[PDB]
Amino acid sequence: VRGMNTSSAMSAFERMEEKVLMQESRAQALGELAGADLETQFAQLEGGSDVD
Amino acid sequence: VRGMNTSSAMSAFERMEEKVLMQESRAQALGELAGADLETQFAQLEGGSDVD
């Protein structure tokens, strides 16, 4: 109940959180960089022009 | 009757008392610490709100 260092529940949550947070943040950041580039933005505009 | 150091009755009571007192005090103290934490208190309030 107190939450000892060696307790399985306390340790598991901490280990899982660190790995999960890093992976989620990295994936989102990588995707954003591609979007940031001007050429990608231009393609979207071209696509809009292309469909009509 | 006087209660010698080597007498079984005198020795047994003293040995039993020291072990028993320490165990009882420690268990009660550990329980109290969990109660002391704010989150536990909040849960009780939430439970009261939840049942109604």
Short mmCIF file of all heavy atoms in Angstrom, two decimals, unseen atoms left out:
data_model
loop_
_atom_site.label_atom_id
_atom_site.label_comp_id
_atom_site.label_asym_id
_atom_site.label_seq_id
_atom_site.Cartn_x
_atom_site.Cartn_y
_atom_site.Cartn_z
N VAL A 1 0.83 -1.20 0.00
CA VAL A 1 0.00 0.00 0.00
C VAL A 1 0.86 1.26 0.00
O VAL A 1 0.57 2.22 -0.71
CB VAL A 1 -0.94 0.04 1.22
N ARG A 2 1.92 1.24 0.80
CA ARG A 2 2.85 2.36 0.89
C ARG A 2 3.55 2.57 -0.45
O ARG A 2 3.76 3.70 -0.89
CB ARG A 2 3.88 2.12 1.99
N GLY A 3 3.92 1.46 -1.08
CA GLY A 3 4.60 1.46 -2.35
C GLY A 3 6.11 1.41 -2.16
O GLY A 3 6.79 2.43 -2.25
N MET A 4 6.61 0.21 -1.91
CA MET A 4 8.04 -0.01 -1.72
C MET A 4 8.75 0.00 -3.07
O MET A 4 8.14 -0.21 -4.11
CB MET A 4 8.31 -1.32 -0.96
N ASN A 5 10.06 0.25 -3.03
CA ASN A 5 10.87 0.29 -4.25
C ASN A 5 10.87 -1.05 -4.98
O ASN A 5 10.82 -1.10 -6.21
CB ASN A 5 12.30 0.69 -3.91
N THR A 6 10.92 -2.14 -4.21
CA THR A 6 10.94 -3.48 -4.77
C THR A 6 9.57 -4.05 -5.14
O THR A 6 9.48 -5.11 -5.75
CB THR A 6 11.61 -4.47 -3.79
N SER A 7 8.49 -3.35 -4.77
CA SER A 7 7.15 -3.84 -5.08
C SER A 7 6.99 -3.95 -6.59
O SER A 7 7.42 -3.06 -7.33
CB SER A 7 6.10 -2.89 -4.51
N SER A 8 6.37 -5.03 -7.07
CA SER A 8 6.19 -5.24 -8.50
C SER A 8 5.31 -4.19 -9.18
O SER A 8 5.62 -3.73 -10.27
CB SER A 8 5.61 -6.63 -8.75
N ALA A 9 4.20 -3.82 -8.53
CA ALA A 9 3.28 -2.86 -9.13
C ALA A 9 3.91 -1.48 -9.34
O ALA A 9 3.74 -0.88 -10.39
CB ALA A 9 2.03 -2.74 -8.27
N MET A 10 4.62 -0.99 -8.33
CA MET A 10 5.26 0.32 -8.44
C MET A 10 6.35 0.34 -9.51
O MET A 10 6.44 1.27 -10.31
CB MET A 10 5.85 0.74 -7.09
N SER A 11 7.18 -0.70 -9.52
CA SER A 11 8.27 -0.81 -10.48
C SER A 11 7.80 -0.96 -11.92
O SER A 11 8.35 -0.34 -12.83
CB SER A 11 9.18 -1.98 -10.12
N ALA A 12 6.77 -1.78 -12.12
CA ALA A 12 6.25 -2.04 -13.46
C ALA A 12 5.69 -0.79 -14.12
O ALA A 12 5.92 -0.54 -15.30
CB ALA A 12 5.19 -3.13 -13.40
N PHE A 13 4.94 0.00 -13.36
CA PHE A 13 4.35 1.22 -13.89
C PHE A 13 5.41 2.22 -14.32
O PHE A 13 5.31 2.83 -15.38
CB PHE A 13 3.42 1.85 -12.86
N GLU A 14 6.44 2.38 -13.48
CA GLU A 14 7.51 3.31 -13.79
C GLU A 14 8.31 2.90 -15.02
O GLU A 14 8.61 3.73 -15.88
CB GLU A 14 8.45 3.44 -12.59
N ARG A 15 8.63 1.61 -15.12
CA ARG A 15 9.40 1.11 -16.26
C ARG A 15 8.60 1.25 -17.55
O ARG A 15 9.14 1.66 -18.58
CB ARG A 15 9.78 -0.35 -16.04
N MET A 16 7.32 0.91 -17.49
CA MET A 16 6.44 0.98 -18.65
C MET A 16 6.25 2.42 -19.12
O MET A 16 6.25 2.69 -20.32
CB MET A 16 5.08 0.37 -18.32
N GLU A 17 6.08 3.33 -18.17
CA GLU A 17 5.86 4.73 -18.49
C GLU A 17 7.03 5.38 -19.21
O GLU A 17 6.83 6.12 -20.17
CB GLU A 17 5.56 5.52 -17.20
N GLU A 18 8.25 5.11 -18.76
CA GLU A 18 9.42 5.70 -19.39
C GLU A 18 9.58 5.26 -20.83
O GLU A 18 9.84 6.07 -21.72
CB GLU A 18 10.68 5.35 -18.60
N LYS A 19 9.43 3.96 -21.08
CA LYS A 19 9.56 3.42 -22.43
C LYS A 19 8.44 3.92 -23.34
O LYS A 19 8.68 4.30 -24.49
CB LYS A 19 9.56 1.89 -22.40
N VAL A 20 7.22 3.91 -22.82
CA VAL A 20 6.05 4.35 -23.59
C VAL A 20 6.09 5.83 -23.95
O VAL A 20 5.77 6.21 -25.08
CB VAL A 20 4.75 4.08 -22.81
N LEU A 21 6.48 6.67 -22.99
CA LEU A 21 6.53 8.10 -23.22
C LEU A 21 7.55 8.49 -24.29
O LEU A 21 7.27 9.32 -25.15
CB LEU A 21 6.85 8.83 -21.92
N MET A 22 8.73 7.88 -24.22
CA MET A 22 9.78 8.18 -25.18
C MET A 22 9.39 7.77 -26.60
O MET A 22 9.62 8.52 -27.55
CB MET A 22 11.07 7.47 -24.78
N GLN A 23 8.81 6.59 -26.73
CA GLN A 23 8.40 6.09 -28.04
C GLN A 23 7.30 6.93 -28.67
O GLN A 23 7.35 7.24 -29.86
CB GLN A 23 7.94 4.63 -27.93
N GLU A 24 6.30 7.29 -27.88
CA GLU A 24 5.18 8.08 -28.38
C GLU A 24 5.62 9.48 -28.81
O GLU A 24 5.21 9.97 -29.86
CB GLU A 24 4.09 8.19 -27.31
N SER A 25 6.46 10.11 -28.00
CA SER A 25 6.94 11.45 -28.29
C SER A 25 7.81 11.48 -29.55
O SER A 25 7.69 12.38 -30.38
CB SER A 25 7.74 11.99 -27.11
N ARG A 26 8.68 10.48 -29.68
CA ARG A 26 9.58 10.40 -30.83
C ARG A 26 8.84 10.21 -32.15
O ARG A 26 9.18 10.84 -33.15
CB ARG A 26 10.59 9.27 -30.62
N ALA A 27 7.83 9.34 -32.15
CA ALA A 27 7.07 9.07 -33.36
C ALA A 27 6.32 10.31 -33.83
O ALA A 27 6.31 10.62 -35.03
CB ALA A 27 6.10 7.93 -33.12
N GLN A 28 5.71 11.02 -32.89
CA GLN A 28 4.96 12.23 -33.22
C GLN A 28 5.89 13.32 -33.76
O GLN A 28 5.55 14.02 -34.72
CB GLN A 28 4.21 12.75 -31.99
N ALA A 29 7.05 13.46 -33.13
CA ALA A 29 8.02 14.47 -33.54
C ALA A 29 8.55 14.23 -34.95
O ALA A 29 8.71 15.16 -35.73
CB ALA A 29 9.17 14.51 -32.54
N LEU A 30 8.83 12.97 -35.26
CA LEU A 30 9.35 12.61 -36.58
C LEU A 30 8.34 12.94 -37.67
O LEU A 30 8.70 13.45 -38.73
CB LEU A 30 9.70 11.12 -36.62
N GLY A 31 7.07 12.66 -37.40
CA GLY A 31 6.00 12.93 -38.34
C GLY A 31 5.86 14.42 -38.61
O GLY A 31 5.63 14.85 -39.74
N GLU A 32 6.00 15.21 -37.55
CA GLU A 32 5.88 16.66 -37.63
C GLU A 32 6.94 17.29 -38.52
O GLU A 32 6.66 18.23 -39.26
CB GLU A 32 5.95 17.27 -36.23
N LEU A 33 8.16 16.77 -38.46
CA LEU A 33 9.26 17.31 -39.26
C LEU A 33 8.97 17.20 -40.75
O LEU A 33 9.26 18.13 -41.51
CB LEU A 33 10.57 16.59 -38.92
N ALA A 34 8.40 16.08 -41.18
CA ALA A 34 8.07 15.89 -42.59
C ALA A 34 7.03 16.91 -43.03
O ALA A 34 7.11 17.48 -44.12
CB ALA A 34 7.55 14.47 -42.82
N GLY A 35 6.04 17.15 -42.16
CA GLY A 35 4.99 18.12 -42.41
C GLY A 35 5.52 19.53 -42.51
O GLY A 35 5.06 20.33 -43.32
N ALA A 36 6.52 19.82 -41.68
CA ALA A 36 7.13 21.14 -41.61
C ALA A 36 7.79 21.56 -42.93
O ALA A 36 7.75 22.74 -43.29
CB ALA A 36 8.16 21.18 -40.48
N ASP A 37 8.38 20.61 -43.65
CA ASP A 37 9.06 20.93 -44.90
C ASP A 37 8.09 21.57 -45.91
O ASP A 37 6.93 21.17 -46.01
CB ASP A 37 9.67 19.67 -45.50
N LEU A 38 8.58 22.56 -46.65
CA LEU A 38 7.77 23.29 -47.63
C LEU A 38 7.24 22.45 -48.79
O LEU A 38 6.12 22.64 -49.24
CB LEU A 38 8.58 24.47 -48.19
N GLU A 39 8.05 21.51 -49.27
CA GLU A 39 7.66 20.68 -50.40
C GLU A 39 6.40 19.86 -50.09
O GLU A 39 5.52 19.72 -50.94
CB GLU A 39 8.80 19.74 -50.80
N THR A 40 6.32 19.33 -48.87
CA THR A 40 5.16 18.55 -48.48
C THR A 40 3.90 19.42 -48.50
O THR A 40 2.84 18.98 -48.94
CB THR A 40 5.33 17.95 -47.07
N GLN A 41 4.03 20.65 -48.01
CA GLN A 41 2.91 21.59 -47.99
C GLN A 41 2.45 21.91 -49.40
O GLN A 41 1.25 22.01 -49.67
CB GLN A 41 3.30 22.87 -47.26
N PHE A 42 3.41 22.08 -50.30
CA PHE A 42 3.13 22.39 -51.70
C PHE A 42 2.35 21.25 -52.37
O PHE A 42 1.45 21.49 -53.17
CB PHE A 42 4.43 22.65 -52.47
N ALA A 43 2.71 20.02 -52.03
CA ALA A 43 2.06 18.84 -52.60
C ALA A 43 0.57 18.82 -52.23
O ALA A 43 -0.26 18.47 -53.06
CB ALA A 43 2.74 17.58 -52.11
N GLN A 44 0.25 19.19 -51.00
CA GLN A 44 -1.14 19.21 -50.55
C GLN A 44 -1.93 20.21 -51.38
O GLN A 44 -3.06 19.94 -51.78
CB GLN A 44 -1.22 19.57 -49.07
N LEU A 45 -1.33 21.37 -51.63
CA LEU A 45 -1.98 22.41 -52.44
C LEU A 45 -2.18 21.89 -53.86
O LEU A 45 -3.23 22.12 -54.47
CB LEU A 45 -1.12 23.68 -52.46
N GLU A 46 -1.18 21.20 -54.38
CA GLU A 46 -1.23 20.63 -55.72
C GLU A 46 -2.34 19.58 -55.80
O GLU A 46 -3.05 19.50 -56.80
CB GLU A 46 0.11 20.00 -56.09
N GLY A 47 -2.47 18.78 -54.74
CA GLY A 47 -3.48 17.75 -54.69
C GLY A 47 -4.87 18.35 -54.76
O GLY A 47 -5.75 17.83 -55.44
N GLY A 48 -5.07 19.46 -54.05
CA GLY A 48 -6.35 20.14 -54.05
C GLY A 48 -6.65 20.65 -55.45
O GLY A 48 -7.78 20.58 -55.92
N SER A 49 -5.63 21.21 -56.10
CA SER A 49 -5.78 21.69 -57.46
C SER A 49 -6.06 20.52 -58.40
O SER A 49 -6.87 20.63 -59.32
CB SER A 49 -4.51 22.42 -57.91
N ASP A 50 -5.37 19.41 -58.17
CA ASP A 50 -5.52 18.22 -59.00
C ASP A 50 -6.91 17.56 -58.95
O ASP A 50 -7.42 17.13 -59.99
CB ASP A 50 -4.46 17.19 -58.61
N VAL A 51 -7.50 17.45 -57.77
CA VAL A 51 -8.81 16.81 -57.67
C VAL A 51 -9.95 17.56 -58.38
O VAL A 51 -10.80 16.93 -59.01
CB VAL A 51 -9.21 16.50 -56.20
N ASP A 52 -9.97 18.89 -58.29
CA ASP A 52 -11.04 19.66 -58.92
C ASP A 52 -11.07 19.55 -60.46
O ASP A 52 -12.15 19.45 -61.04
CB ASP A 52 -11.05 21.13 -58.45
N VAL B 1 9.19 -18.54 43.30
CA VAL B 1 8.32 -17.48 43.80
C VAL B 1 9.01 -16.13 43.72
O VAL B 1 8.40 -15.13 43.34
CB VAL B 1 7.90 -17.74 45.26
N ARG B 2 10.29 -16.10 44.08
CA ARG B 2 11.08 -14.87 44.03
C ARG B 2 11.22 -14.39 42.59
O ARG B 2 11.15 -13.20 42.31
CB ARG B 2 12.46 -15.11 44.64
N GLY B 3 11.42 -15.35 41.69
CA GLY B 3 11.59 -15.08 40.28
C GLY B 3 13.05 -14.94 39.92
O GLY B 3 13.57 -13.83 39.78
N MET B 4 13.72 -16.08 39.77
CA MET B 4 15.13 -16.12 39.41
C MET B 4 15.29 -15.83 37.92
O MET B 4 14.35 -15.99 37.14
CB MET B 4 15.77 -17.46 39.78
N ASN B 5 16.49 -15.40 37.53
CA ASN B 5 16.79 -15.09 36.14
C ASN B 5 16.63 -16.30 35.24
O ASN B 5 16.14 -16.20 34.11
CB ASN B 5 18.21 -14.53 36.02
N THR B 6 17.06 -17.46 35.73
CA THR B 6 16.99 -18.71 34.98
C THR B 6 15.63 -19.41 35.02
O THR B 6 15.42 -20.39 34.31
CB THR B 6 18.06 -19.71 35.47
N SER B 7 14.71 -18.93 35.85
CA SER B 7 13.40 -19.56 35.96
C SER B 7 12.70 -19.49 34.60
O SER B 7 12.75 -18.46 33.93
CB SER B 7 12.55 -18.86 37.02
N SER B 8 12.05 -20.58 34.19
CA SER B 8 11.37 -20.62 32.90
C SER B 8 10.21 -19.63 32.77
O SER B 8 10.06 -18.99 31.73
CB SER B 8 10.86 -22.03 32.63
N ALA B 9 9.39 -19.51 33.81
CA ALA B 9 8.24 -18.62 33.75
C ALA B 9 8.63 -17.15 33.58
O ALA B 9 8.03 -16.44 32.77
CB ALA B 9 7.39 -18.79 35.00
N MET B 10 9.62 -16.70 34.35
CA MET B 10 10.05 -15.31 34.25
C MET B 10 10.67 -15.00 32.89
O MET B 10 10.37 -13.96 32.29
CB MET B 10 11.05 -14.99 35.36
N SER B 11 11.52 -15.89 32.41
CA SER B 11 12.19 -15.72 31.12
C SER B 11 11.23 -15.75 29.94
O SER B 11 11.35 -14.94 29.01
CB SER B 11 13.26 -16.79 30.93
N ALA B 12 10.28 -16.67 29.97
CA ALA B 12 9.33 -16.82 28.87
C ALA B 12 8.45 -15.59 28.68
O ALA B 12 8.21 -15.16 27.55
CB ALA B 12 8.46 -18.05 29.10
N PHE B 13 7.97 -15.02 29.78
CA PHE B 13 7.12 -13.85 29.71
C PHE B 13 7.87 -12.66 29.12
O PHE B 13 7.33 -11.93 28.28
CB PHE B 13 6.59 -13.49 31.10
N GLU B 14 9.11 -12.46 29.55
CA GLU B 14 9.91 -11.35 29.06
C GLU B 14 10.23 -11.48 27.57
O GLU B 14 10.12 -10.51 26.82
CB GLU B 14 11.21 -11.25 29.86
N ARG B 15 10.60 -12.68 27.15
CA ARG B 15 10.93 -12.91 25.74
C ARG B 15 9.71 -12.72 24.85
O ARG B 15 9.79 -12.11 23.79
CB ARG B 15 11.49 -14.32 25.55
N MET B 16 8.58 -13.25 25.30
CA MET B 16 7.33 -13.15 24.56
C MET B 16 6.86 -11.71 24.44
O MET B 16 6.39 -11.28 23.38
CB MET B 16 6.25 -13.99 25.23
N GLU B 17 6.97 -10.96 25.53
CA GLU B 17 6.53 -9.58 25.56
C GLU B 17 7.29 -8.68 24.60
O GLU B 17 6.69 -7.85 23.91
CB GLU B 17 6.66 -9.02 26.98
N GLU B 18 8.61 -8.83 24.54
CA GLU B 18 9.41 -8.00 23.66
C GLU B 18 9.07 -8.22 22.19
O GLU B 18 8.91 -7.27 21.43
CB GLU B 18 10.90 -8.26 23.88
N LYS B 19 8.95 -9.49 21.79
CA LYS B 19 8.61 -9.81 20.41
C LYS B 19 7.20 -9.37 20.05
O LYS B 19 6.97 -8.81 18.97
CB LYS B 19 8.76 -11.32 20.17
N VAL B 20 6.26 -9.62 20.96
CA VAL B 20 4.86 -9.26 20.73
C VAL B 20 4.63 -7.75 20.64
O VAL B 20 3.89 -7.28 19.78
CB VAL B 20 3.97 -9.81 21.86
N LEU B 21 5.27 -7.00 21.53
CA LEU B 21 5.11 -5.55 21.56
C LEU B 21 5.63 -4.89 20.29
O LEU B 21 4.99 -4.00 19.74
CB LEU B 21 5.83 -4.96 22.77
N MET B 22 6.80 -5.33 19.83
CA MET B 22 7.40 -4.76 18.63
C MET B 22 6.55 -5.02 17.39
O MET B 22 6.34 -4.13 16.57
CB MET B 22 8.80 -5.32 18.42
N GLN B 23 6.06 -6.25 17.26
CA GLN B 23 5.25 -6.63 16.11
C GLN B 23 3.92 -5.88 16.06
O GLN B 23 3.50 -5.41 15.01
CB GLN B 23 4.99 -8.14 16.12
N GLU B 24 3.25 -5.78 17.21
CA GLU B 24 1.97 -5.09 17.28
C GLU B 24 2.10 -3.60 16.97
O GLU B 24 1.29 -3.04 16.23
CB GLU B 24 1.35 -5.28 18.67
N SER B 25 3.12 -2.97 17.54
CA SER B 25 3.34 -1.55 17.33
C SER B 25 3.68 -1.23 15.87
O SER B 25 3.18 -0.26 15.31
CB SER B 25 4.47 -1.05 18.23
N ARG B 26 4.52 -2.06 15.27
CA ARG B 26 4.94 -1.86 13.89
C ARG B 26 3.79 -1.99 12.90
O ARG B 26 3.67 -1.19 11.97
CB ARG B 26 6.04 -2.86 13.53
N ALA B 27 2.93 -2.98 13.10
CA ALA B 27 1.80 -3.20 12.21
C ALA B 27 0.83 -2.02 12.25
O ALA B 27 0.34 -1.57 11.21
CB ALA B 27 1.08 -4.49 12.56
N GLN B 28 0.54 -1.54 13.45
CA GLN B 28 -0.37 -0.41 13.62
C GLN B 28 0.19 0.86 12.99
O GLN B 28 -0.53 1.61 12.34
CB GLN B 28 -0.66 -0.18 15.10
N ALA B 29 1.49 1.08 13.18
CA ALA B 29 2.15 2.26 12.65
C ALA B 29 2.15 2.28 11.12
O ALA B 29 1.92 3.32 10.51
CB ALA B 29 3.58 2.34 13.17
N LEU B 30 2.39 1.12 10.51
CA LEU B 30 2.42 1.02 9.06
C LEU B 30 1.05 1.35 8.47
O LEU B 30 0.95 2.03 7.45
CB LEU B 30 2.86 -0.38 8.64
N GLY B 31 0.00 0.85 9.11
CA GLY B 31 -1.36 1.09 8.66
C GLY B 31 -1.71 2.56 8.73
O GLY B 31 -2.38 3.10 7.84
N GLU B 32 -1.26 3.22 9.79
CA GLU B 32 -1.53 4.63 10.02
C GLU B 32 -0.93 5.52 8.93
O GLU B 32 -1.54 6.51 8.51
CB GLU B 32 -0.99 5.06 11.38
N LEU B 33 0.27 5.18 8.47
CA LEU B 33 0.95 5.97 7.44
C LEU B 33 0.14 6.02 6.15
O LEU B 33 0.05 7.07 5.51
CB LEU B 33 2.34 5.41 7.17
N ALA B 34 -0.45 4.89 5.76
CA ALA B 34 -1.26 4.84 4.55
C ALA B 34 -2.48 5.76 4.69
O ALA B 34 -2.85 6.46 3.75
CB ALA B 34 -1.71 3.41 4.28
N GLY B 35 -3.09 5.74 5.87
CA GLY B 35 -4.24 6.56 6.18
C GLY B 35 -3.90 8.04 6.14
O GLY B 35 -4.69 8.87 5.71
N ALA B 36 -2.70 8.36 6.61
CA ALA B 36 -2.22 9.74 6.69
C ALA B 36 -2.13 10.42 5.32
O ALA B 36 -2.40 11.61 5.21
CB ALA B 36 -0.86 9.77 7.37
N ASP B 37 -1.77 9.66 4.29
CA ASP B 37 -1.63 10.23 2.96
C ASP B 37 -2.95 10.86 2.48
O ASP B 37 -4.02 10.31 2.72
CB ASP B 37 -1.17 9.16 1.97
N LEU B 38 -2.86 12.00 1.79
CA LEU B 38 -4.03 12.73 1.30
C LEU B 38 -4.87 11.97 0.27
O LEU B 38 -6.10 12.06 0.29
CB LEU B 38 -3.59 14.07 0.71
N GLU B 39 -4.22 11.23 -0.62
CA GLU B 39 -4.93 10.51 -1.66
C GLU B 39 -5.90 9.49 -1.08
O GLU B 39 -7.02 9.34 -1.58
CB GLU B 39 -3.94 9.80 -2.59
N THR B 40 -5.49 8.80 -0.02
CA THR B 40 -6.35 7.81 0.61
C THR B 40 -7.60 8.48 1.18
O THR B 40 -8.71 7.96 1.07
CB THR B 40 -5.62 7.06 1.74
N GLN B 41 -7.41 9.65 1.80
CA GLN B 41 -8.51 10.40 2.38
C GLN B 41 -9.49 10.84 1.29
O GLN B 41 -10.71 10.80 1.48
CB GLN B 41 -7.99 11.62 3.13
N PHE B 42 -8.94 11.26 0.15
CA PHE B 42 -9.75 11.71 -0.98
C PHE B 42 -10.62 10.57 -1.52
O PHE B 42 -11.77 10.78 -1.90
CB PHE B 42 -8.85 12.25 -2.09
N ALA B 43 -10.05 9.37 -1.55
CA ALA B 43 -10.77 8.19 -2.04
C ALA B 43 -12.00 7.91 -1.20
O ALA B 43 -13.06 7.56 -1.73
CB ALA B 43 -9.85 6.99 -2.05
N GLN B 44 -11.88 8.06 0.12
CA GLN B 44 -13.00 7.83 1.02
C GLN B 44 -14.13 8.81 0.71
O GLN B 44 -15.30 8.43 0.69
CB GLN B 44 -12.56 7.98 2.48
N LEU B 45 -13.77 10.07 0.47
CA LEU B 45 -14.75 11.09 0.14
C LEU B 45 -15.42 10.75 -1.19
O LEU B 45 -16.63 10.90 -1.34
CB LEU B 45 -14.07 12.46 0.04
N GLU B 46 -14.62 10.28 -2.14
CA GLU B 46 -15.11 9.88 -3.45
C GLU B 46 -16.08 8.71 -3.32
O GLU B 46 -17.10 8.65 -4.01
CB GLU B 46 -13.95 9.51 -4.37
N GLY B 47 -15.74 7.77 -2.45
CA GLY B 47 -16.57 6.60 -2.22
C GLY B 47 -17.93 7.00 -1.69
O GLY B 47 -18.95 6.45 -2.10
N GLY B 48 -17.95 7.97 -0.78
CA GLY B 48 -19.19 8.46 -0.22
C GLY B 48 -20.03 9.10 -1.31
O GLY B 48 -21.25 8.93 -1.36
N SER B 49 -19.38 9.87 -2.17
CA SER B 49 -20.05 10.51 -3.28
C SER B 49 -20.57 9.44 -4.25
O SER B 49 -21.66 9.55 -4.79
CB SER B 49 -19.10 11.46 -4.01
N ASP B 50 -19.75 8.42 -4.47
CA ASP B 50 -20.09 7.34 -5.39
C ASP B 50 -21.29 6.49 -4.98
O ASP B 50 -22.11 6.12 -5.83
CB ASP B 50 -18.87 6.42 -5.58
N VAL B 51 -21.40 6.14 -3.70
CA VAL B 51 -22.52 5.31 -3.26
C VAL B 51 -23.90 5.98 -3.39
O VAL B 51 -24.86 5.32 -3.78
CB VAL B 51 -22.32 4.76 -1.82
N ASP B 52 -24.00 7.26 -3.06
CA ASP B 52 -25.29 7.95 -3.14
C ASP B 52 -25.87 8.04 -4.56
O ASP B 52 -27.08 7.87 -4.73
CB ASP B 52 -25.25 9.33 -2.44
#
